[PDB]
Design a binder for this molecule. Structure first.
Ligand SMILES: O=C(O)[C@@H]1C=CC(=O)N1C[C@@H](O)[C@@H](O)[C@H](O)[C@H](O)CO
Ligand SMILES: [Zn+2]
Ligand SMILES: [Zn+2]
Ligand SMILES: [Zn+2]
Ligand SMILES: [Zn+2]
Ligand SMILES: [Zn+2]
Ligand SMILES: [Zn+2]
Length: 491
C-alpha cells in the first residue's frame, strides 16, 4: 500500500545538515539515518551504529557500524560517517547544529566498520546530538560529486529511497528493500503532499484526499478527534516565545527583555492564536522531568503592564521605541501570536511592525539573524538537559535556529559547560538549577506558553506515532512502522 501525507509546507531544502523546519525534517527522517536516532518511546536506538562505547568521562566515543547499504547500493562505511561529520563541523558551512557538534576534535576510521570520536571537552549529550535529523549519514563519494549541486537527488540509508520531487506539489519516496530492519518499512510508498494553507490541509483529510496530516490547527482538533473516520494523535511538547537579536540596541538589555515578559498577557496568545488550548509559562520553558525544572521558580514573571513600563523607563526608554517582529503568515498560530504581541507591547510604548512572509522566507531571515526579534515556536532539540546549550550558549556560531543572535554570557557558558561534563545527575541538577537563576535574570529568551502539537490520521492508518514531548518534530521517523488498510482515493 501507499500513504499520502499532508505536510504543512514544502521543504526549502533536503540538504541534510540544514534545519529548514518540521516539513523538511519529516521527509529527511523517511530517507535518512544517523549513527543513532530516537525510537518511538524516546530511547536512543542504535541505527547505522550497531553498538557504541562512551568513555567514563564522555570524551571518547567508538561506533561499531552495522552491515548496511545506501540507496545507490554502496556499503555504509566509516569514511562516509567521517565525511558527513566533517560537513557539519566545517566553519564555512551551513550546518544548523555546528555549535553543538563542534567539540568533536578528532575523527578516526581504524577500519571500514569503526568510527572513533575524541572531543576537546566532555559531553554527556553528544550521543543525543548524533540523533539529530541533521546528523544523518550520507556517502562520502556522493558528497564529493554533489559539492556544487544544492538540488542533487538525495542518497541515504533510511527505510525509503527518494523517488521524485514535483515542485509545489509533492515528494514521493519508495520502500528501500535493502534496509537493515526486518519487515520495515511496511508501506511501499509515501507521497508527502504540500498543503501550505491549513484549511486546505484539514479539508484534504476530511474529504479523503490524504491519509495523515501534520500541524492540525487548534480550531479543528475537537472535530477531528470526534471522528469517527479520523483520529487525533496528541502531544504538548513545544513552547511559544521570542528570540531577540541582541545587536538591536534595546534587546541587548535584560531589563527590556524582562519588560516584554511582564507586558505580554499569556491568555491573549492562548485564546486568540490557539483557540484556548495550551498553558501559560511564567519562567524558563523546562518540562517536568528535566533538570532545572522547579515549581518554586515557575512564577518568576507575571502579567504586569505598569511594572513593564517602569523597566523600560529604567533601561532608558521612557517613551518606548519602534521595532519589527518577524513571524510568518503560513501558520495561523504564528501570525496570531505576532498580532497579540504587537497589541500587548503597544500598551508599554513599543511600536511593533510585523513581517509575515511564508515559512521558507522567515527561516532564511532567521538563519542569518536578519531580524530585530522573532516569534519562536520550538522545543529542545534533544531530550538531555543540554538542549539548553542550543538556546543559551555563546560559542563560535552566534546565530542559530533557536538562540537570541549574539547573546554570550560567560557565567551561563561556564555552567552549561560544567553541566555537559558532569556525568552524575545528582551533581548535574545543582548546575542546571544555578543556570536557571541566571537564565531568568538575563532573559535572553522569553517564553509564553506550552502548545499542543497534533497529527491526524484517517481510520485505517496505524503505527504512526506523535513522538513524546520534545520529540514531536521527529515523528516522521515513525513512518517506518506505519501501516494502512487497503483503500482508494475517490475510486
Ligand atoms: O512549529 C513552529 O512553530 C514552526 C512552524 C514551522 C516550523 O517548522 N516551525 C519550527 C521552527 O519554528 C523551529 O524548528 C526553528 O528552530 C525556529 O527557527 C525557532 O524560532
Ligand atoms: Zn491513501
Ligand atoms: Zn569497541
Ligand atoms: Zn508508485
Ligand atoms: Zn503522489
Ligand atoms: Zn492574563
Ligand atoms: Zn495587559
Amino acid at each position: 500500500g501507499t500513504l499520502y501525507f499532508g505536510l504543512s509546507g514544502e521543504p526549502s531544502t533536503l540538504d541534510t545538515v540544514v534545519q529548514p523546519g518540521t516539513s523538511g525534517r519529516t521527509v529527511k527522517l523517511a530517507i535518512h539515518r544517523g549513527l543513532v536516532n530516537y525510537g518511538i518511546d524516546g530511547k536512543i536506538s542504535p541505527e547505522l551504529a550497531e553498538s557504541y562505547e562512551v568513555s567514563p568521562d564522555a570524551k571518547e566515543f567508538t561506533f561499531h557500524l552495522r552491515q548496511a547499504k545506501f540507496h545507490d547500493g554502496t556499503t555504509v562505511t566509516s569514511a562516509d560517517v567521517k565525511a558527513s561529520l566533517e560537513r557539519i563541523l566545517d566553519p564555512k558551512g551551513k550546518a544548523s547544529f555546528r555549535n553543538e557538534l563542534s567539540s568533536i576534535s578528532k575523527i578516526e576510521t581504524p577500519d571500514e566498520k569503526t568510527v572513533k570520536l575524541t572531543l576537546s571537552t566532555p559531553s554527556v549529550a553528544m550521543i543525543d546530538y548524533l540523533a539529530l535529523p541533521e546528523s544523518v549519514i550520507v556517502p562520502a563519494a556522493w558528497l564529493a560529486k554533489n559539492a556544487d549541486n544544492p538540488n542533487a537527488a538525495p542518497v541515504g540509508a533510511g527505510p525509503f529511497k527518494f523517488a521524485g520531487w514535483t515542485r509545489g506539489r509533492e515528494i514521493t519516496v519508495k520502500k528501500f528493500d535493502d534496509y537493515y530492519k526486518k519487515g520495515k518499512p511496511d508501506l511501499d510508498e509515501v507521497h508527502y503532499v504540500f498543503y501550505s494553507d491549513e484549511n486546505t490541509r484539514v479539508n484534504a483529510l476530511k474529504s479523503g484526499d490524504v491519509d495523515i496530516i501534520d500541524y492540525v490547527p487548534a480550531k479543528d482538533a475537537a472535530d477531528i478527534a470526534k471522528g469517527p473516520e479520523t483520529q487525533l494523535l496528541r502531544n504538548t511538547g513545544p513552547f511559544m516565545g521570542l528570540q531577540f537579536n541582541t545587536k538591536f540596541e534595546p534587546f541587548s538589555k535584560p531589563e527590556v527583555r524582562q519588560a516584554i515578559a511582564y507586558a505580554v498577557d499569556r491568555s491573549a496568545i492562548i485564546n486568540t492564536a490557539f483557540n484556548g488550548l495550551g498553558s501559560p509559562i511564567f519562567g524558563i520553558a523546562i518540562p517536568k522531568g528535566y533538570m532545572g525544572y522547579s515549581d518554586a521558580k515557575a512564577n518568576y514573571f507575571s502579567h504586569h503592564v505598569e511594572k513593564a513600563k517602569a523597566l523600560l523607563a529604567k533601561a532608558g526608554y521612557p517613551n518606548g521605541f519602534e521595532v519589527r517582529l518577524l513571524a510568518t503568515s503560513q501558520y495561523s498560530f504564528q501570525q496570531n501570536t505576532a498580532i497579540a504581541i504587537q497589541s500587548e507591547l503597544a500598551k508599554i510604548g513599543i511600536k511593533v511592525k510585523l513581517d509575515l512572509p511564508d515559512w521558507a522566507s522567515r527561516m532564511a531571515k532567521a538563519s542569518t539573524g536578519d531580524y530585530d526579534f522573532t516569534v519562536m515556536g520550538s522545543l529542545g532539540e534533544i531530550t538531555d538537559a543540554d538542549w539548553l546549550s542550543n538556546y543559551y550558549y555563546g560559542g563560535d556560531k552566534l546565530v542559530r535556529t533557536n538562540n537570541s543572535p549574539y547573546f554570550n554570557d560567560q557565567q551561563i557558558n561556564d555552567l552549561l559547560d560544567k553541566g555537559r561534563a558532569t556525568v552524575d545527575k545528582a551533581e548535574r541538577v545543582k548546575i542546571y538549577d544555578a543556570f536557571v537563576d541566571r537564565a531568568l535574570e538575563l532573559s535572553p529568551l522569553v517564553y509564553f506558553m506550552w502548545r499542543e502539537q497534533n497529527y491526524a490520521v484517517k481510520k485505517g492508518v496505524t503505527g504512526f506515532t506523535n513522538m513524546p514531548g520534545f520529540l514531536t518534530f521527529q515523528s516522521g521517523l515513525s513512518i517506518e512502522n506505519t501501516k494502512i488498510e487497503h483503500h482508494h482515493h475517490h475510486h
